Amino acid sequence: VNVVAGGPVANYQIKVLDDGKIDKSATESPANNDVQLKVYAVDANGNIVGDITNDVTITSEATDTNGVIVNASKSTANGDTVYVITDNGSKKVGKETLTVKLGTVTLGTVDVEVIDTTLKATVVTKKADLIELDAADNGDALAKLLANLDIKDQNGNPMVDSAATPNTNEKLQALKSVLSGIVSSDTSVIGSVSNVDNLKDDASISGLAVKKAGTVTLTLVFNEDSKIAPIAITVKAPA
Ligand SMILES: [Ca+2]
Ligand SMILES: [Ca+2]
Ligand SMILES: [Ca+2]
Ligand SMILES: [Ca+2]
């Protein structure tokens, strides 16, 4: 639009140029990492008699109260000012109220929303009740245990290892995001895992080392948020 000589201002518009959302995912396509605002003064006939985006000040709550934290910055290019709202350390998702002032006078408010569309492990199931290790497992049950699980995201799609990345197993990473611990029925055969970070992501995953030949039940326990029930898998580690 253009600013034009018109009549006296009748009202102010706080205009959202984009979708009004900020996606704190690290990979969303297309990138969705801001909200962009204009503030216009308009006369009785809708003529834009002022672009006051550069003159106003936009703020959010001084002390955080909802785990949603945003920054507001005036960005000027091509003669035009856009008020750019960005995520700044939001721990949660949800709405954040912006207040738009001209000097000390409030012109209005507008909410922005922080979202997160990251693919998230949502369903985990076991394929078989039992797995048996052989020499290829090199005395560690983790690879064969992972192969015995199916992980689905919130869309119900599989979460699997990408062969494009040789040194990180995306499926293991998906598991660890919802796993709280692994209990072994006999820690002398295979140790229990209480710190899930000890499930080592690498070209060759590891962390369920066999201490001696035998048979154990491994029970996977998941976090409360996921609501996934424990999964028990019997592991035979033959001599
Ligand atoms: Ca946006
Ligand atoms: Ca993002
Ligand atoms: Ca907040
Ligand atoms: Ca990979």
Measured in Å, how far apart are the chain's first and last C-alpha atoms? 78
> Which residue range is the domain that position 188 belongs to?
121-239
Give the type of residue at 9. V
Distance, in Å, from the CA atom of 197 to the CA atom of 180, rounded to the nearest integer, reads 10
Tokens of residue 157, six digits: 């799609």
Distance (Å) of CA 125 to CA 145, 164, 177: 11, 25, 15
Q: Provide the 10 A C-beta neighbour count for residue 178.
A: 20
What is the CA(146)–ligand 2 centre distance, in A? 29
What is the CA(96)–ligand 3 centre distance, in A? 6
**Chosen domain end from 120, 136, 153:** 120
Q: Provide the 10 A C-beta neighbour count for residue 2.
A: 6
What is the CA(20)–ligand 1 centre distance, in A? 5
Note whether 112 and 137 are same-domain residues. no
Contact of 35 with 128, CB cutoff 8 Å? no
Note whether 67 and 12 are same-domain residues. yes
Which ligand is nearest to the Cα of residue 202, counting in written order?
4
Best CA proximity match to 131, nearest among 114, 149, 117: 149
What is the CA(17)–ligand 3 centre distance, in A? 22
Note whether 108 and 154 are same-domain residues. no
**Any idea what DSSP says for residue 136?**
G
As annotated, the binding site for Ca(2+) includes 18-19, 21, 23, 25, 28, 32-34, 61, 64, 66, 68, 96, 161-162, 165, 168, 170
What is the CA(112)–ligand 1 centre distance, in A? 9
Contact of 33 with 86, CB cutoff 8 Å? yes
Helix (H/G/I), strand (E/B), else coil: 137: helix
Note whether 180 and 95 are same-domain residues. no
Phi, psi torsion values for 219, nearest 5 degrees: -110, 115
Note whether 51 and 154 are same-domain residues. no
**Which single residue is written with the structure tokens 């690498």?**
202
**Chosen domain end from 120, 152, 178:** 120
What is the CA(73)–ligand 2 centre distance, in A? 18
Note whether 63 and 169 are same-domain residues. no
Distance, in Å, from the CA atom of 46 to the CA atom of 7, rounded to the nearest integer, reads 9
As annotated, the binding site includes 18-19, 21, 23, 25, 28, 32-34, 61, 64, 66, 68, 96, 161-162, 165, 168, 170
What is the CA(238)–ligand 2 centre distance, in A? 48
| Ion ligand 1: residue ranges with CB closer than 5 A | 18-19, 21, 32
Give the type of residue at 205. I
Q: Provide the 10 A C-beta neighbour count for residue 138.
A: 12
Task: Name the strand (E) or helix (H) holding 150.
Answer: strand 149-152
Task: Name the strand (E) or helix (H) holding 70.
Answer: strand 70-77
Note whether 85 and 195 are same-domain residues. no
Q: After which residues is the chain broken (C to N over 2.5 A)?
A: none
Distance (Å) of CA 138 to CA 10, 24, 126: 77, 40, 22
The contacts of residue 85 (CB under 8 Å, 6+ apart) are: 22, 34, 35, 36, 37, 58, 70, 71, 72, 73, 98, 112
Number of domains the chain contains: 2
Resolution rounded to one decimal, in angstroms: 1.7
Note whether 238 and 127 are same-domain residues. yes
Which ligand is nearest to the Cα of residue 23, counting in written order?
2
What is the CA(17)–ligand 1 centre distance, in A? 9
Note whether 157 and 205 are same-domain residues. yes
Note whether 54 and 131 are same-domain residues. no
Distance (Å) of CA 85 to CA 18, 91, 106, 123: 11, 16, 18, 34
Note whether 113 and 181 are same-domain residues. no
Best CA proximity match to 215, nearest among 184, 181, 194: 184
Give the type of residue at 221. V
Can you give 211-239 as a three-state secondary structure string?
A: CCCEEEEEEEEECCCCCCCCEEEEEEECC
**Chosen domain end from 120, 143, 173:** 120
